Write a protein that binds this ligand. Structure first.
Ligand SMILES: *[C@@H]1O[C@H](CO)[C@@H](O[C@@H]2O[C@H](CO)[C@@H](O)[C@H](O)[C@H]2NC(C)=O)[C@H](O)[C@H]1NC(C)=O
Length: 536
């Protein structure tokens, strides 16, 4: 590590749009709303806000500050503190790959909808007629046409994770475009993104505002809004609610991934990373709540319309459930708009840009570290590494093109983007407070900011944050052993078809969990041992 001296000598609007790039993403617009409805609004929102202040901000500040200090990427930072801690960056890289795997699938879906958004009568605006034009399609009439276009016309979802059917070639063609668009950006887009984020980070708020204006003017919006902030104590006492809220914060802030550390690694040795952390954290949080208010306003409308056809509570709880919640909700909203096609295009364009940028940043979190690992003949240009990475991920991504793809994505998302992040977070915190030393840390921050971190930072970094990730971790093991795995299925032929049918995951589903959530979590401890033993 350089001496503080070595730094000061090696030293010799924008602020806000770079900051914006960190507050928006598919994690805040696609994942957040779906996880909320999974816990009945309030019971998720409340814990999520609590943990965004006690783990979010502290960890974010602790990331920006460590990478500003060491002037090294995530894989160099940890190895520098202590050599037996390379594992952290390695686990960071694995997690990044496992998220990019299904992040592109999301982006494939986004474009698909964009492709279908150039028709005066949008294809989800109503129900399709049977072969004899005798009535509406049954599955479509019992469910919503917006449900029908997501579940049948788009995904052609099966009824189990075991029933795979074929590969949805439409999805393939989009995913091919998504990966190709990604490869093109990785080769050149990188610099362009630095010049394009100025709109990609602003457009979201613009479009969301329009959708907020319509959402709040929809009958029943309030029913939705209040449901988002009235916690069901019983659910608020579930160890899985506090486990999911925990991971959501790390996924929204992009913490426990490595990008933020590398980003700060290129900041001035005197940049105030204490303000950056706060500003970014606040906006990122507002963004998620803002998106939830938009979505829940629409959910309220839909449910209220059914409580009218016929408590609203039950209706709201059974309005929209799953990963496609965002696609279904925002599409329903679009249908209720003048010249809908224009709005559909605007929305899918901004979502595609928000996704492309989010995915590009994630790709870096896989390629950069690999390059540093020096695991390839130097000759091989970054192109080779990137193309190879893209190709490999795309190949596995075909699992989501299957008719059971949605079931797969849900499974992976529930693990690949959860426990692993929690582990990395704790590891990082501990390594900086107990290995690197909190005292040294405080002095270094006092050298670049001028003052030592307040008591808040101290208590959070030393006790509260670590303790929280310990109890939440324990929860994970009281949930994995005290709750049989179950997933909802879309079976048109089933009593209360529109209702949810939570079936049990096959036994082979555990080998999947052990791979996605296990390898990255054990990468840190494994490497440590390797080094230690090798050290003797
Ligand atoms: C409030 O939340 C609780 C907690 O999830 C809900 O209770 C669940 O009800 C379902 C349906 O019968 C059961 O399968 C679960 O086992 C229950 N979980 C627990 C821990 O109680 C409840 O339905 C929600 N509704 C209310 C009362 O607001």
């Amino acid at each position: 590590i350089p001496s503080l001296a070595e730094l000061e000598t090696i030293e010799q609007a924008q602020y806000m749009l770079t900051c914006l790039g960190f507050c928006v993403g598919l994690g805040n617009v696609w994942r957040f709303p779906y996880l909320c409805q999974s816990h009945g609004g309030g019971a998720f929102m409340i814990p999520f806000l609590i943990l965004l202040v006690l783990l979010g901000i502290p960890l974010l500040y602790l990331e920006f500050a460590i990478g500003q200090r060491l002037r090294r990427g995530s894989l160099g930072v940890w190895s520098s503190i202590h050599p037996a801690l390379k594992g952290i960056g390695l686990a960071s890289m694995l997690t990044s790959f496992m998220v990019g795997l299904y992040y592109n699938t999301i982006i494939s879906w986004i474009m698909w909808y964009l492709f279908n958004s150039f028709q005066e009568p949008l294809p989800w605006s109503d129900c399709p007629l049977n072969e004899n034009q005798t009535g509406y399609v049954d599955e479509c009439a019992r469910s919503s046409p917006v449900d029908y276009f997501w579940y049948r016309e788009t995904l052609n979802i099966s009824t189990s994770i075991s029933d795979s059917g074929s590969i949805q070639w439409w999805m393939l063609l989009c995913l091919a475009c998504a990966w190709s668009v990604l490869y093109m950006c990785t080769i050149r887009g990188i610099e362009t993104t630095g010049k394009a984020v100025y709109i990609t980070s602003t457009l979201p708020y613009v479009v969301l505002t329009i959708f907020l204006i319509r959402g709040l003017t929809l009958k029943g919006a309030t029913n939705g809004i209040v449901f988002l902030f009235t916690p069901n104590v019983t659910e608020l006492a579930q160890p899985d609610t506090w486990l999911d809220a925990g991971a959501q914060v790390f996924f929204s802030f992009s913490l426990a991934f490595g990008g933020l550390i590398s980003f700060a690694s290129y900041n001035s040795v005197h940049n105030n990373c204490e303000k950056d952390s706060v500003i970014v954290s606040i906006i990122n949080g507002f963004t998620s709540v803002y998106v939830a208010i938009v979505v829940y306003s629409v959910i309220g409308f839909r449910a209220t319309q059914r409580y009218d056809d016929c408590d609203i509570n039950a209706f709201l709880s059974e309005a929209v459930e799953g990963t496609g919640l965002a696609f279904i909700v925002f599409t329903e909203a679009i249908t209720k708009m003048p010249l809908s096609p224009l709005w559909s295009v605007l929305f899918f364009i901004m979502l595609f840009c928000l996704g492309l940028s989010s995915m590009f940043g994630n790709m870096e979190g896989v390629v950069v570290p690999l390059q540093d690992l020096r695991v390839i003949p130097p000759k091989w240009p970054k192109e080779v590494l990137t193309g190879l990475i893209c190709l490999g991920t795309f190949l596995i991504g075909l699992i989501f093109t299957l008719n059971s793809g949605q079931y797969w994505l849900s499974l992976l998302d529930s693990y690949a983007g959860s426990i692993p992040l929690l582990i990395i977070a704790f590891a990082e915190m501990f390594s900086v407070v107990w290995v690197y030393g909190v005292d040294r840390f405080n002095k270094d921050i006092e050298f670049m900011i001028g003052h030592k971190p307040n008591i808040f930072w101290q208590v959070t970094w030393r006790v509260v944050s670590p303790l929280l990730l310990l109890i939440i971790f324990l929860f994970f093991f009281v949930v994995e052993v005290s709750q049989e795995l179950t997933y909802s299925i879309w079976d048109p032929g089933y009593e209360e078809f529109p209702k949810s049918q939570k079936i049990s995951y096959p036994n082979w589903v555990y080998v999947v969990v052990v791979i996605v959530a296990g390898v990255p979590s054990l990468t840190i401890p494994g490497y440590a041992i390797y080094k230690l033993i090798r050290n003797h």
